[PDB]
Amino acid sequence: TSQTVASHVPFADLCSTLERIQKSKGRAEKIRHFREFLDSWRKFHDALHKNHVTDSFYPAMRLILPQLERERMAYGIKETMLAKLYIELLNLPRDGKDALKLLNYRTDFAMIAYFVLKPRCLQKGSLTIQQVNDLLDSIASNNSAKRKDLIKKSLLQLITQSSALEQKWLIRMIIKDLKLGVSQQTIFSVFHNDAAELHNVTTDLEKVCRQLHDPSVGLSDISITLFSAFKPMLAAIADIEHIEKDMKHQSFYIETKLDGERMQMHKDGDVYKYFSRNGYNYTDQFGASPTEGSLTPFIHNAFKADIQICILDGEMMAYNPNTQTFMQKGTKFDIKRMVEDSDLQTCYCVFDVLMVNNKKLGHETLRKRYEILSSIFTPIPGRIEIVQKTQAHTKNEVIDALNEAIDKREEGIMVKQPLSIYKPDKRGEGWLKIKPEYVSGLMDELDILIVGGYWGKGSRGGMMSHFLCAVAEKPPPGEKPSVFHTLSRVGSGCTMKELYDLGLKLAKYWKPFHRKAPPSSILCGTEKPEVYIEPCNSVIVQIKAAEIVPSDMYKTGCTLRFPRIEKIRDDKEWHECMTLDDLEQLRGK
Amino acid sequence: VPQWEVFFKR
Ligand SMILES: [Hg+2]
Ligand SMILES: [Hg+2]
Ligand SMILES: [Hg+2]
Ligand SMILES: [Hg+2]
Ligand SMILES: [Hg+2]
Ligand SMILES: [Hg+2]
Ligand SMILES: [Hg+2]
Ligand SMILES: [Hg+2]
Ligand SMILES: [Hg+2]
C-alpha cells in the first residue's frame, strides 16, 4: 500500500556501506561491499512486495551517485554555512582552532567536519534513507523559495538525528562528491548490465533503477525516446593533418561549429520539452507550448504539416536581428538580459534529428538523417535554422573551411562521416571538431592598429566585414609614428557588441582609398582596402593568431594565420601600436 | 512483514 524498502532501511546501513567501499583498497573489495548492500535490498524488496510496484533502488542510488540527481534542484548550501551551524550545535569555542578550521576551510570538508564530530557527537542515527531523502527534498525546495530559515531547520533535523559518521556522508551527498574510489561507470555496471546504456538515453536514475530492477532481465533495443533526456553525441578533437584517413578515405561533411548552448528539442503536437547537455529541464525558458516561452511560440508554426512528433539535436544561439549575427559567449555585455530585454533573441541552430513521427532514427546514417531534417521544418532565419554543411573529400578543402570559419569569427569547424550513426555520449566515431593550433604566448596578444576597411553586403553595407591592420614603422625620437605597414586582413563580424560600438565610433573617419593616389601614412602590399583611416583617428585591436607566415599581400612581407580580434584596446593610444621591430623579434622567438 | 535487519545482516 505505497510501501517502500527505503522506509525500512536505516540511513546508517547505507553509510556503513559507503564507508567500507571508500576504505577498501582493491576494486574487487569495493565492488563486493556495494554488491552485498544491493543484493540485500533486492531480496528484501521481493519479500516486501510479494503480495503487491514502482518501488526501486532509486532512493539509495540517488545518494550513491549524487552528481546524477535530477529530480531535486540545487541545495544552495555552502561549507561556510555548515561550519557556523556546527559551531552552534557542538558549542565549540567561537575563537578556537576547530571553529576557525571549519570557517576557514579552503575548497575535504566532510572529513574536517567528521574529525571535529567524532569525539563530541556520540549519537546513534535514527533516519531511514527515505527520511533522509525527504529532508533533502525540503532543503532544495526551500532553497528555490529562498526560505533561509526553513533550510536551516531541515539541516537541523538531519544533523541532530544522525551519527557523526552519517553526517560525514550527508555532507558529501550535499556537496555531490562521495569520493568512493570507484567510478560512476563501475557503479552502473555492478547494478545492471544495461544500466549505462539506459542512462545514456534517459538521464534519469529513477527510470534506470525501476526499469532494470531485475538484474537478470535485460532490455532490448535501448533507444532514444520522446520526452526522455539523452546524452548528446560528442566530437573528438582532430589534427587537420590526418583528416582524409580519419574520414575513412571517402567523402565527408563539413559543418559550421557553433558555440551556443547544446540543447535537444522534443515535440508532440503542441507539447514541447527541452533538455540541456546534462539532462536538466529548460522547458521553462524556451516554452512548453506555442503560447509561452522565449522560442516555442516563434517556431511552432515553422514545422511542416505532416510532422506531429520529432526530436531535434542542436545549439541555442543569441541572435541580433539588426545585424543578422550570432553573439559570442565572451562579451563584456549581458547576453541573457539583452535576450530578455528583447535586444537579442533566442535562435535554435539544428544539426540532427532523432525521431520523426515514430520513426526512430538513431541507427540511420547521418546522411539519411540530414535528408529527413530538411523535411521537418521550414527554417526561419534568426529563430530556427538548419546548420550549414557541405560535402568534401580533400584536406585542402578542410583547410579552406577552417580559413573561412575563423574569418567569420567562428572558432572552428566540424567534420562528420556520412555513414555514421548517432551514438549518445560517445566522443569520436563520426564527429570530429577542428580548431586552430593556438600557442599561448606573445602570439596571443598582437596589438595592432586598424588602418582600413571593407564593406559588408546589401543592408549590412554600412557595416564592415573586415579590417585591414598594420604595424608601425619606428619613428624618429620625439615624434609619433607616421608610417604604417600592412600586416593582416581580419574579420569584423559583429559577434560582440564592442565590435558594433567600434564600427560606429570609426564611421565618421573612413576616407575612400585610391590606388593611384594612396595615403603616405599607410604602405600596402598586394591587398588594398576599400577605405582607410588616418592612424591618429584609429584604434588598436588585440589579435590572436596561430602562426606568422610569408605573404606578398601585406607590406610586412608576411601575415597572420587564423587571426581573431580578441579585444578592442581603447585603453591604448593609436601610437602605442606594435612596431615592425616588435614583429621582427616576435617572428624568430 | 519481513524485517530488513534479517536481510542486511545476512
Ligand atoms: Hg551531534
Ligand atoms: Hg539506478
Ligand atoms: Hg540559429
Ligand atoms: Hg553585434
Ligand atoms: Hg557588423
Ligand atoms: Hg562591426
Ligand atoms: Hg597603400
Ligand atoms: Hg587625430
Ligand atoms: Hg614579418
- Resolution of the PDB structure in angstroms: 2.4
Q: Which three cell numbers stand for residue A336?
A: 541573457
Which CA distances in Å does A525 have to A453, A468, A484, A555? 15, 11, 12, 4
**Minimal-distance CA residue of chain B relative to A14:** B8
| A47·B10 Cβ contact <8 A | no
Is A12 in CB contact (< 8 Å) with chain B?
A: no
Nearest to A449 by CA among A518, A397, A500, A502: A502
C-alpha R_g of chain B: 6
| Closest-CA distance of chain B to residue A41, Å | 8
Strands A464-472 and A484-491 turn out to be antiparallel
The secondary structure element, H or E, covering residue A133 is: helix A129-144
Cβ neighbourhood burial of A53 (10 Å; 0-12, 13-18, 19+): exposed
User: Following DSSP, what letter does each residue of A162-211 receive, concatenated?
Assistant: S-HHHHHHHHHHHHT----SS-HHHHHHHH-TTHHHHHHHS--HHHHHHH
* d(C-alpha A542, C-alpha A446), whole Å: 5
User: Following DSSP, what letter does each residue of A468-488 receive, concatenated?
Assistant: EEEEEPPPPTTSPP--EEEEE
Name the H helices within A235-279. Answer: 243-246
Does residue A52 contact residue A46 with C-beta atoms inside 8 Å?
no
Name the DSSP letter for residue A122: -
Q: Which three cell numbers stand for residue A185?
A: 561507470
Helix (H, G, I), strand (E, B) or coil at A352: strand
Is A48 in CB contact (< 8 Å) with chain B?
A: yes
* d(C-alpha A490, C-alpha A289), whole Å: 43
Which CA distances in Å does A271 have to A25, A143, A275, A291? 50, 29, 14, 11
Does residue A505 contact residue A533 with C-beta atoms inside 8 Å?
no
The residue annotated as part of the active site, out of A257, A267, A497, A555, is A257
Does residue A485 contact residue A580 with C-beta atoms inside 8 Å?
yes
Chain B CB contacts of A40 under 8 Å are: 4, 7-8, 10
* d(C-alpha A335, C-alpha A260), whole Å: 11
Does residue A449 contact residue A436 with C-beta atoms inside 8 Å?
no
Chain B CB contacts of A15 under 8 Å are: none
Please give the backbone phi and psi of residue A576, each rounded to the nearest 5 degrees, phi first: -80, 15
Please give the backbone phi and psi of residue A167, each rounded to the nearest 5 degrees, phi first: -65, -40
Name beta bridge partners: A408. none
Does residue A165 contact residue A19 with C-beta atoms inside 8 Å?
yes
| A48·B2 Cβ contact <8 A | yes
* Interface residue of A5, A17, A40, A55 to substitute, partner B, most B CBs within 10 Å: A40
| B7·A47 Cβ contact <8 A | yes
* d(C-alpha A265, C-alpha A313), whole Å: 7
Please give the backbone phi and psi of residue A360, each rounded to the nearest 5 degrees, phi first: -100, 140
| B8·A47 Cβ contact <8 A | no
Is A7 in CB contact (< 8 Å) with chain B?
A: no
For residue A114, the ligand closest to its alpha carbon is 1
Does residue A70 contact residue A204 with C-beta atoms inside 8 Å?
yes
**Minimal-distance CA residue of chain B relative to A47:** B2
Please give the backbone phi and psi of residue A361, each rounded to the nearest 5 degrees, phi first: -125, 5
**Could you tell me the domains of chain A?**
1-224 (1.10.3260.10), 225-437 (3.30.470.30), 438-589 (2.40.50.140)
Does residue A505 contact residue A538 with C-beta atoms inside 8 Å?
no
Technique of determination: X-ray
| Residue A377 half-sphere exposure toward CB, CA atoms < 13 A | 27
Nearest to A589 by CA among A548, A536, A533: A548
Q: Which three cell numbers stand for residue A188?
A: 552502473
Please give the backbone phi and psi of residue A178, each rounded to the nearest 5 degrees, phi first: -80, -25
CA of A448 to the centre of ligand 6 (A): 17
| Burial state string for A371-381 with b = 16 or more CB within 10 A and e = fewer than 16 | ebbeebbeeee
Nearest to A315 by CA among A368, A256, A254, A271: A256
Sequence letter at residue A128: T
Sequence letter at residue A171: I
* d(C-alpha A37, C-alpha A56), whole Å: 14
Is A257 noted as a catalytic residue in this protein?
A: yes
| Closest-CA distance of chain A to residue B7, Å | 5
Dihedral (Cα; A505, A506, A509, A510), 10-degree rounding: -150
Name beta bridge partners: A512. A531
Return the residue matching grid coordinates 505505497: A2
| B8·A13 Cβ contact <8 A | yes
* Strand ranges (E), A250-330: 252-256, 261-268, 271-276, 309-320, 325-327
Does residue A483 contact residue A473 with C-beta atoms inside 8 Å?
yes
* d(C-alpha A17, C-alpha A108), whole Å: 19
Does residue A378 contact residue A342 with C-beta atoms inside 8 Å?
no
* d(C-alpha A6, C-alpha A9), whole Å: 5
